[PDB]
Design a protein around this ligand. Structure first.
Ligand SMILES: [Ca+2]
Ligand SMILES: [Ca+2]
Ligand SMILES: [Ca+2]
Ligand SMILES: [Ca+2]
Lengths: 633, 633
């Protein structure tokens, strides 16, 4: 396919390595002695030679006596299809003649050693390293796309394989060597491991990476394969697309103090697999919770919920360097996948700077507000938006309005999420909340028995409507926070809430904030009102004009398929049941969702807007392969 | 198209601005008094109202008595198609009823003011700003692609136009304002100009850009248009794609110390036009030359060449802050184009840190080797490579091998050229040359009477073949450098050159360097041997093992269509003509190329490998529009 220039040298022999998959064009005119008129040629069995004049080519026999006029426009094309062995003498010889006699006045030779050199990866994405995929030097998205995929080492049987395959005689001819190399830029993105001395053992050493840009490879004769393992060192990010290159070159020695000439180069491209987040609709595997040792109702009720499922429960306690919610706030469960292998990968952002066990990879963060917590990071189910499908869903991050001067998640984390590309992040407005997390106002739940889902939204208007109804019904004196002794002296009733004029105005405003988010979610997730259910919520404004929960936010719930762990609201008691619990059941249960209310606050005797427990669910990855997506340019 | 949430408020009136191109979904259930059972509605002439229950919608008359059951799943959809005027009373009123009587127990209203707000650009790329192109919020490549294009101000009638078009009543309702804005990131990429006080004059002020991220716009009633002019501040580069965004928002006042809510936002995208280089095949306009005042033969011969064409000649002399070749080395002629306008743009990189006149834009550079000179920057004619078309050609930059430790053009300039994208740069190997410029070894020329072109390559093998022929013919004592008195004592003859064994070896090596480039050029430009002509050249090796010209390099030539200004080689005289001149004529003239040899060295009495003049040709731009290309992702 690729034409390489090799000229005969005046009255001499040229020796050259021929790399299979290329061919040579050979100038015979320049090596012709002055006064020479015509030329003839001989060649060996395994070398194919054409005489090319003005673009027109004719094959030549091994020993012909045929002669052609010498012209700069008459050249040779030289091709080989099989590697040289010790039995080979591969050559082309050209005889030169003057006008007078038929005995050659001079001759120029070309002696060839043919070798196969191919740097191979699994570009067709089946988990096997195929021989010389013609597409291995590029990377394309989609079901028809090709090029190899690399996993970040988040901690070598599970790394990517790269195989240098060669075929040839006992040794390379004098003056050649084979070198593997990478660019300085890619040197902090990858590393490559190799057994340098296979005669002395199995020991794999790092041959390419930080501080090592090239490695000279030992040539072995016959048909040989050299196995390399490759790891990614980092995820795609603001200035890094995820694509890296590795090269092998056959180098020719020229002279001392002159660099070696790269006479053949083969290239493979890898893309580093992105970090992917799992939405609530995916099958649960493990439920992780953190709380204080004595919150007994919480642990018992979570255990009972989990016992309704096939999931395993993992209990963590509170640590000195972490928040009360850390399993929710400082940890996010995600995954990476390559054709051959995949594993769960946790983003870890410790408050002050344990874990899950060996089955997980970990990405730990190297100015920060509450909006940096992973409570502020959510992901939608797969959605179609104006005809465009997002098969992995879309990441949702809470923010403030552009002109507001409000809080925002750090650019570093936003840039990281954006750079993964396959979840196409969307910013929502969370900064009207004191804590500032999207998970305080919204969640997703599957609809049992279907492939569909609902968006759940906190609604203050729903709460006021319900409370007004109960008051009309004669329940105005129904008290909230039953069983929280630290709330009792406040004597909070439906009447007291409904009569508070400033609280009404605060909550109308918070409903405007919720509705602004509702509109962004409908637009960017392609949802209609039929896809949404509102759950009652109520907030109190702080000094910053931001919202804190008046009673526990029910929307932030543990979703295990049909079973929902819902924070216990401690609402007004009507006929000895919480009217908030009954209302929420009436909304959800007709859909086949099973509700379990989980009391995370009783142990503290009161509720001031802060939650002291956290939960996080590890889920099975999407069955859709991320490399089958086609993201926008 | 876009659904916006507007809820009725319990027993009250809500007033809202309606922006045309959206519609409202309206909750009536939350505003219902406790105990209310059914509702009815009235609406004005220009407001369309549907009652929506469980996804099913039915239009409602202006005054109906129809009643519907109150349910959270029964809502209103509210649409307007025309802007409000002073004659409008646009409203929807909802009456609430209990089980008992038919007289309403309460009512909630919605009072609307409809306005049109559209931020408009020329997205369809015809030079006119069309009304609200649905595609203005994106940017796509190709003949079917859309989105607006911005020119860099390289120095406002020629800037891009952006028009804010509004329609509505005499004033915005209380609590609203319209604001134009950009991101902090884009603030150094753009600037926007506006007449802030049209009553006091025509004065245009900078309203958005560095240090100004937002501008409050004055609303005028009726049908109004506000004209803005937009400029790009910089070209695409390593961390900047070329894409920028400008937004207009309608903001709602909530309260003191609470940020304004962006209730409607419209966005336009601009792409900043790339800098594009012109190949030798494009029509010449002006020829620029620099030399010392007394190089008379040079000026006379260049003038005579130019007089064979319709081109204009511009003569520059030597300056203290610049090189002897500066018009070639420190200046590169290129262009930018937008649908409405285009102009030539010069890259200027002064050696130590005049010009062309007002018709040109200038980009001046803010560690450096010879490879940074623009002699080391070339561009191919349009080419097709493995089925992929490069309609603007491909930029060529000289470099050294990856593992060599050799010189390279600075990353800053390489990154810039790559970031323009439309010329898809290719690196060649120039570092075997002392000066290190691709223009020392290669050039392109059209084939007269056709749409085709040739690559010209320097060849040492061609020179040795020619000299060997002349020696065989009895011309061995023919002397070179005739008329250069400072060379005479050297007595350089064909015999003396051919007998120098080390010089032969040096030049065989230089031919290997040339051939390595030949192979890259054939591969990356999709050329065959039929596309190439070799011209004789000869070099001498320096202490760094790099090549300097033995006699002037003929390949670096002035190409004006069929007419070629070729450096005079001062070769061996045979029958009182230079055998190099005669040889080159014999190669080129049969193709209809007319050769004029230009003596740039006689004034210096000798030639040591350095050229003391420079030339550069300004050309007409490609007729193919760059935005019609589709570059690789
Ligand atoms: Ca494979
Ligand atoms: Ca989260
Ligand atoms: Ca237009
Ligand atoms: Ca140039």
């Amino acid at each position: 396919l690729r034409e390489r220039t090799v000229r005969l040298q005046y009255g001499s022999r040229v020796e050259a390595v021929y790399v299979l998959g290329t061919y040579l064009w050979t100038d015979v005119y320049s090596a012709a002695p002055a006064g020479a008129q015509t030329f003839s040629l001989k060649h060996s069995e395994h070398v194919w030679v054409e005489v090319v004049r003005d673009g027109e080519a004719e094959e030549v026999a091994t020993n012909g006596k045929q002669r052609w006029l010498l012209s700069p426009s008459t050249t040779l094309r030289v091709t080989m299809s099989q590697a040289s062995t010790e039995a080979s003498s591969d050559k082309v010889t050209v005889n030169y003649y003057d006008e007078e006699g038929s005995i050659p006045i001079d001759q120029a030779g070309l002696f060839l050693t043919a070798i196969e050199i191919s740097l191979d990866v699994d570009a067709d994405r089946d988990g096997v390293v195929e021989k010389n995929n013609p597409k291995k030097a590029s990377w394309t998205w989609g079901p028809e796309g090709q090029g190899a995929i690399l996993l970040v080492n988040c901690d070598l049987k599970d790394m990517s394989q790269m195989i240098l395959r060669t075929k040839g005689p006992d040794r390379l001819p004098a003056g050649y060597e084979i070198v593997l190399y990478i660019s300085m830029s890619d040197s902090d993105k990858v590393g490559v491991f190799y057994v340098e001395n296979p005669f002395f053992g199995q020991r794999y050493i790092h041959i390419l990476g930080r501080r090592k840009l090239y490695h000279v490879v030992k040539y072995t004769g016959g048909s040989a394969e050299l196995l390399f393992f490759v790891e990614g060192l980092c995820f795609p990010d603001e200035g890094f697309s995820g694509l890296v290159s590795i090269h092998v070159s056959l180098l020719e020695y020229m002279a001392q103090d002159i660099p070696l000439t790269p006479i053949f180069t083969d290239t493979v491209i890898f893309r580093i697999a992105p970090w992917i987040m799992t939405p609530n609709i995916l099958p649960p595997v493990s439920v992780f919770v953190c709380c204080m040792k004595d919150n007994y109702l919480f642990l018992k009720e979570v255990k009972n919920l989990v016992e309704k499922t096939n999931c395993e429960l993992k209990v963590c306690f509170q640590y000195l360097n972490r928040g009360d919610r850390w399993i929710q706030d400082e940890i996010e469960f995600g995954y990476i996948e390559a054709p051959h292998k995949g594993f769960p990968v946790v983003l870890d952002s410790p408050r002050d700077g344990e874990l899950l066990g060996p089955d997980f990879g970990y990405v730990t963060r190297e100015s920060v507000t509450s909006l940096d917590s992973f409570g502020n990071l959510e992901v939608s189910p797969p959605v179609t938006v104006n005809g465009k499908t997002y098969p992995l869903g879309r990441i949702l991050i809470g923010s403030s309005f552009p002109l507001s001067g409000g809080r925002r998640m750090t650019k570093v984390v936003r840039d990281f999420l954006k750079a993964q590309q396959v979840q196409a992040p969307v910013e929502l407005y969370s900064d009207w909340l004191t804590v500032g997390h999207v998970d305080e106002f919204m969640s997703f739940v599957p609809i049992p028995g279907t492939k569909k889902f609902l968006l759940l939204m906190a609604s203050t208007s729903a709460c006021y409507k319900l409370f007004r109804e109960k008051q009309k019904d004669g329940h105005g004196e129904a008290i909230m926070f039953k069983g929280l002794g630290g709330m009792s002296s406040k004597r909070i009733t439906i009447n007291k809430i409904l009569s508070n004029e400033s609280l009404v105005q605060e909550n109308l405003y918070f409903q405007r904030c919720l509705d602004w988010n509702r509109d962004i979610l409908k637009k960017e997730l392609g949802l209609t009102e039929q896809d949404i259910i509102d759950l009652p919520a109520l907030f109190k404004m702080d000094e910053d004009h931001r919202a804190r929960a008046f009673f526990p936010n029910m929307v932030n719930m543990i979703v295990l398929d049909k079973d929902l762990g819902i924070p216990k609201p401690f609402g007004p008691q009507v006929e000895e049941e919480c009217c908030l619990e009954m209302h929420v059941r009436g909304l959800l249960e007709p859909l086949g969702l099973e509700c379990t209310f989980i009391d995370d606050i009783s142990a503290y005797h009161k509720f001031l807007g802060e939650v002291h427990c956290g939960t996080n669910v590890r889920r099975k990855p999407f069955t859709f392969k991320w490399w089958h997506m086609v993201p926008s340019r």
